[PDB]
């Protein structure tokens, strides 16, 4: 039905209108803590805040604020943590969160710099031989390896708690070619990237929620998560076609504002869920066709 639905909307060109309806109907919950004066400097954007009911709380008894939201998708049974791109002063908080929430993967969908603007801090080591230490949160971070592809890069990081001298492996999945307020090049490139993430196990129920961010943590992040959850649902339901993408997006917006920032991102999500259904419904070969089409070399 969603492909039937997708057809009417394109045919009549109503993406902007359909998108404005989602915006009109989205939830509005208080952001009290995010707005406290002492937390001014912990927010990259003063108009993108986590809701109080779903914000992630740092376990430091001084100030527990981080701009980050737990997105708990019940029917689909996946949780994601959506966050803003760490600021030079909240890098220690970010990794505190990753440690405390027991996350195994981090998905970064932006670049540190876009159109000459600073969009995110360099919060992970670019060189094996130069590790990072976050003094405020007593954590250590070390680049272990990095498989670089044409449009993304997977890294293996070692995060160590200096307090307890325990270490974990964190996988880092950086999509380098997704412009702010833009879409990926193709459904193929996106889906190929999403499936690399799934295949790493980082999304396994046995780990904390994967951390997903871009600069603000709503647009590309929202797009990434919607598509994933919708595909998840088409798998579970005895009826894959029933899945209403607009409804899933509204469910998700109960947990963080603004998810999906443009009408073209919404359109893209349909493309990606539709295409990705092919795999859900048995076409084994289709995944190799996204690898050849995404041009990951």
């Amino acid at each position: 039905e969603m492909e039937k639905e997708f057809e009417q909307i394109d045919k009549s060109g109503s993406w902007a209108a359909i998108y404005q309806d989602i915006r009109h109907e989205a939830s509005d919950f208080p952001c009290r803590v995010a707005k406290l004066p002492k937390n001014k400097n912990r927010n990259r954007y003063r108009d993108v805040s986590p809701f109080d009911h779903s914000r992630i709380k740092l376990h430091q008894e001084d100030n527990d604020y981080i701009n980050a939201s737990l997105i708990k998708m019940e029917e689909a049974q996946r949780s994601y943590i959506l966050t803003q791109g760490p600021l030079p002063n909240t890098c220690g908080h970010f990794w505190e969160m990753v440690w405390e929430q027991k996350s195994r993967g981090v998905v970064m969908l932006n670049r540190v710099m876009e159109k000459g603007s600073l969009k995110c801090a360099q919060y992970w080591p670019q060189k094996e031989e130069k590790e990072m230490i976050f003094e405020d949160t007593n954590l250590k971070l070390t680049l272990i390896s990095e498989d670089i592809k044409s449009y993304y890069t997977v890294r293996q990081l070692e995060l160590e708690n200096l307090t307890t001298q325990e270490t974990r492996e964190i996988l880092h999945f950086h999509y380098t070619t997704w412009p702010d307020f833009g879409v990926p090049e193709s459904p193929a490139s996106f889906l190929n990237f999403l499936f690399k993430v799934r295949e790493s196990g980082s999304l396994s129920p046995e780990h904390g929620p994967v951390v997903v961010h871009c600069s603000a943590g709503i647009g590309r992040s929202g797009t990434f998560c919607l598509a994933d959850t919708c595909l998840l649902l088409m798998d579970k339901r005895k009826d894959p076609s029933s899945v209403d993408i607009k409804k899933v997006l509204l469910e998700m917006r109960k947990f963080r504002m603004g998810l999906i920032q443009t009408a073209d991102q919404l359109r893209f999500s349909y493309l990606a869920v539709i295409e990705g259904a092919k795999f859900i419904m048995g076409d084994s070969s289709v995944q190799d066709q996204w690898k050849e089409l995404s041009h990951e070399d």
Partner: peptide, 6 residues
């Protein structure tokens, strides 16, 4: 400003 995404 710069502290606004929207």
């Amino acid at each position: 400003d710069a502290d606004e995404y929207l």
